[PDB]
């Protein structure tokens, strides 16, 4: 098990093959990322939030998240979007990403994207995409403005209060 964004990730089902890919950000900057190519299921465990993740090759399929605060749910969603490696998240980067903090702390590209959206995630949520939802027991929706909804939700995100 590995840690990412303060969340503990564990693969429960599926398989993937790591592949290096060169991607282009929204600020026209190149990055070398290790793409886990294949279908996978993960469990995300944090101090204030918990979620179940489903992904494919650079595609988030399903994220069922719970937590104590609306802020703690936002934290889990962002991490899942960055871990998904989707193009909607890469192309939402507004600025060139550094790989070394001011106090010489080297960072890998995936942690570079995580810190960029942990700071400001308005562009990510706006351009991630919304989708209609069906009245399913224990599953509610949430909008790019963290507004709960029983009719729409951020694409693939379903809060389980």
């Amino acid at each position: 098990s590995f840690s990412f964004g303060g969340f503990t990730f564990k693969r429960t089902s599926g398989s993937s093959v790591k592949k290096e890919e060169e991607v282009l950000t929204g600020n026209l900057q190149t990055l070398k990322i290790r793409v886990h190519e294949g279908y996978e299921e993960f469990t995300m465990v944090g101090r204030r939030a918990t979620a179940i993740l489903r992904k494919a090759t650079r595609r988030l399929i399903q994220l069922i998240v719970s937590g104590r605060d609306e802020q703690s749910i936002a934290e889990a969603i962002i991490v899942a979007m960055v871990f998904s490696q989707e193009d909607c998240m890469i192309k939402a980067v507004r600025g060139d990403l550094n790989f070394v903090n001011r106090a010489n702390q080297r960072l890998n590209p995936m942690h570079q994207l995580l810190r960029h959206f942990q700071k400001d995630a308005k562009v990510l949520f706006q351009n991630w995409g919304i989708e209609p939802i069906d009245n399913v027991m224990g599953m509610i929706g949430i909008l790019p403005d963290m507004t709960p909804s029983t009719e729409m939700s951020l694409r693939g995100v379903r809060v389980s209060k």
Partner: nanobody
Amino acid sequence: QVQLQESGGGLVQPGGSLRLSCAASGRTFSMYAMAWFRQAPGKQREFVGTISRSGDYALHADAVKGRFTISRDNAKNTVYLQMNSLKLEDTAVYYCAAGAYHSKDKTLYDYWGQGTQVTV
């Protein structure tokens, strides 16, 4: 927490326009999703539209979509309903509601208003 009172109703000609307003007196207006319902004579409440806590994402009914708009100003604690190309069939009492969820279920809204008469 929140009270709701609607205004702006009255008689208009078919094909007219009427912007309804719903003023709120409460603590955290910004943290409340809103909606508009309407009850025609001899019929139950009908969903018109809902709106996000920010105001960015709105959703309307199949019978008013394209002719009606829902908007809110969180600095004045008011949510408005734009009514366009009004029809004789729009004649009903229009209600204002507030709650936690952006929905079509009248039961999910906790705080309701009084209703304003609109006749076309």
